[PDB]
Symmetry: C3
Subunit: 214 residues, 3 copies
Amino acid sequence: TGPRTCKDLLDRGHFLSGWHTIYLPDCRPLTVLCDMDTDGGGWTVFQRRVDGSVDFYRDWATYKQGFGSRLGEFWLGNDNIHALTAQGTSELRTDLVDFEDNYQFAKYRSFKVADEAEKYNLVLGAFVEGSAGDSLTFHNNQSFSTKDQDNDLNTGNCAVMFQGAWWYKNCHTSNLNGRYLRGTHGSFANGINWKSGKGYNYSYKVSEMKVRPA
Amino acid sequence: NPCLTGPRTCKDLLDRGHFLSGWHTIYLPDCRPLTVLCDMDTDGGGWTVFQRRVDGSVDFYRDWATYKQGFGSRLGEFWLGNDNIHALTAQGTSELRTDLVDFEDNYQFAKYRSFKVADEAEKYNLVLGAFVEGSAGDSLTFHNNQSFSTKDQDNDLNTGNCAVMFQGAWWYKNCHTSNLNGRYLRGTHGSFANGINWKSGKGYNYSYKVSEMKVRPA
Amino acid sequence: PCLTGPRTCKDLLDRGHFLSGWHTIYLPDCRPLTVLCDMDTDGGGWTVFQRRVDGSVDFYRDWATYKQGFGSRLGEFWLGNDNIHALTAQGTSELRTDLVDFEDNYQFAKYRSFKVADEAEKYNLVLGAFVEGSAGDSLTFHNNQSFSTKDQDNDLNTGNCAVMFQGAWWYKNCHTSNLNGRYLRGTHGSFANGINWKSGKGYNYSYKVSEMKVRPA
Ligand SMILES: *[C@@H]1O[C@H](CO)[C@@H](O[C@@H]2O[C@H](CO)[C@@H](O)[C@H](O)[C@H]2NC(C)=O)[C@H](O)[C@H]1NC(C)=O
Ligand SMILES: CC(=O)N[C@@H]1[C@@H](O)[C@H](O)[C@@H](CO)O[C@H]1O
Ligand SMILES: OC[C@H]1O[C@H](O)[C@H](O)[C@@H](O)[C@H]1O
Ligand SMILES: OC[C@H]1O[C@H](O)[C@H](O)[C@@H](O)[C@H]1O
Ligand SMILES: [Ca+2]
Ligand SMILES: [Ca+2]
Ligand SMILES: [Ca+2]
C-alpha cells in the first residue's frame, strides 16, 4: 500500500542506488538493492558479485532464504525472487564487468521463477539485446539445483562439477553463482561464466542480476 | 509530523548521538526527506557529504539533468544532486570541506568559510567564502561566482567546452584549477587535467584515490 | 531485557533478516542502537563492534573517542566502549574474532564469554575460556585488564604500549594482539605496532580484514 518496486521508488525521487524497503505482493516488507543508475534505473537487484568475499557454493536451504551482505555480495533468496516475479511482468537485466572494467549486459523481455514446489523453475522470455550475448535462454524451463538438491539433466551433479547453483541442465552455458575465480582460469566452466560473453574460462569481476516491471 | 521533530542536518544527528558516519534521512527546509551521507568522523563531525569518489565504479561524465537530480550509489560513489545541494545551502551559512587522499595514503584537505549554490535558474552559481586553511592548498577560489557546467550545457567562460575538454562537470571558468568530478584515472595520467585533479594539491596530471566534498552549518 | 523489539542481531536473524548489514537493536532496558549484524559467519547473528578493512579510518584515538565510538558504517569503525559495555555486561556473550590476510586466507578465534565493565572500572576486559580458532589464542593473555589509549596509560609496561604500538587495547606487559593498531598493510619491519594477532601471523604482519563480534552464547 506504498512502494512495491524499485521503479516505484525511482518515480518518487529516490535517485541514488542503495538499499530500500519495498512491499511484496502479500504486503510483506523486503529490504532490497535498488539500481537507480543503469538503463533508466528502477531495477531490483537480486544477485551481486563484486569481490569474492562471499561463499556462493551453498545448499538449498541457504539459496531459498538468501545470503550474503548488504555491503557487498548477496543472493536475495529464491522465495523472495519468486515473490518479486510472481505476477505482472518483470524484465531481466544481467550486468557483467571484467577485470579491465569493460561492461557487457544481457536483457530479456520477461523473467520469473516458480515457487519451491516447482523447484524455482526458470520462466524466461525472449532475448531483447546485449553485448554479453544470450547465455540464459538455454536454461529456460529448468528447475533450480544446488549441491544437496540435484534437479538437473546430467547423470552426475552439475552444482558440484561446476561449484555453483543454477538452473542446470546438462550442464550450463551460464554460471553466475560460480566461484569467484578472478579472470582467466584453466579450470573448465566453474567460475562466474557467461559462455557467449567472455567464455567458459573467464570469471567476471562483477555480476548483477536485476528485475524491473516491463 | 516527523519533519518538525526530525533532524534538519547531519549536525543535528551528531548532537543526538549518532557518532558513526553513514546514511541518514534529514528534512530539507521544505520538509522534503533526503537520505544523505553524514561524516561524523572528520574534523568534529556533522558534515553532509555531497560528492564522493572512491574507486571509479561510477561514471561522472554526465549530463545537466543527471547532475541536477543526482546519481551514483550509497554503496560508494555519488553526486547528491544540484537541486539538493542548493536546498542544503540556500539558507544560513555552511562551511565547506574538501578531503582528498592519494594512492600513497597521503591525506590532504581544503576548508572554506562559506559555500552556497544557487538554484537552477541561476545555473547553480557558486558563491564561495574565504579559504581558511588546508594542506591541499586553495584550488577553488578561482571558481567563485561561476555557473555550473556539464558536457551538454556549456556555461563556462571558455570559447570551447570545458566539460568536454576536461571530461567532468564543474563551476568551470577558463577552465579550471580543480576538477573533482573528472575521470577516475588512478594516480598519474598522461592526459591533461581530465582526472580528479586539484592543481595546488597534486597537479594537473594526478588523479586522487578518494575525493569527498561536504558541508556543515557555521 | 527488551521484550518489545529485537535485542540482538541474533534476534533479527531468527526473525528473517538473512543479509548482513546495519540494523537497529534495542539494548537491555531498552535503548536503540544501529549495529552491524554479521548474518553469514558461523551461523550468523553476530553483532560487530570492531571492523578494519581498508585503513580509511584513524584508530590512534584518545579515550573520549573510544568511549563514544568512531568510524563509518561504510567501512572501518569502533562501536564505542559505552555501547560495548551496554551490549555485553551480563550476558554471557560469545566473542568471535575474524581475520583475513592479503591473499584472502581466512583465520578466526572464538571465546565462550566476553564483557567490558563501565568507564568506572576502566572498561576492564573480562574473558572466558578460549573455545577454538585456527588463528590461535591471542586474547586470553589480556584477560582481566584495563583498556588503554594514548592519553590514558593503564598498562603494566614502564612506557606506554598504546604509543609504542600505536593503538588502543587491553595492554598489560604490553600485548599479544593489537587489533586497534596501525593499518600497516601486510608484512612490516616496524615491530608489533600493527593489526597483529601473534598466534595467527605474529608481530610483523598487518591483516587486511579484522572484525570483533558477539552473539548470545
Ligand atoms: C559574478 O559575476 C558576474 C558576471 O557574471 C558579475 O557581474 C558584473 O559585476 C560587475 C561589477 O563587479 C559589473 O560592473 C558588471 O556590469 C556585471 N556584469 C554582468 C554581466 O552582470 C558579478 O558582479 C559577480 N558577482 C560577485 C558576487 O562577484
Ligand atoms: C506446456 C508443455 O506441454 N510444454 C512443456 C512441457 O511438455 C514440459 O513438461 C515442461 C517442463 O519440461 O515444459 C513445458 O514448456
Ligand atoms: O552507478 C551506481 C551503482 O551503484 C551500485 O553499485 C549498483 O549495484 C550499480 O548497479 C550502480 O547503480
Ligand atoms: O536547462 C534545460 C536544458 O539543459 C541542457 O541543455 C540539457 O540538454 C537539457 O536538460 C535541456 O532541457
Ligand atoms: Ca544430475
Ligand atoms: Ca564555453
Ligand atoms: Ca604503564
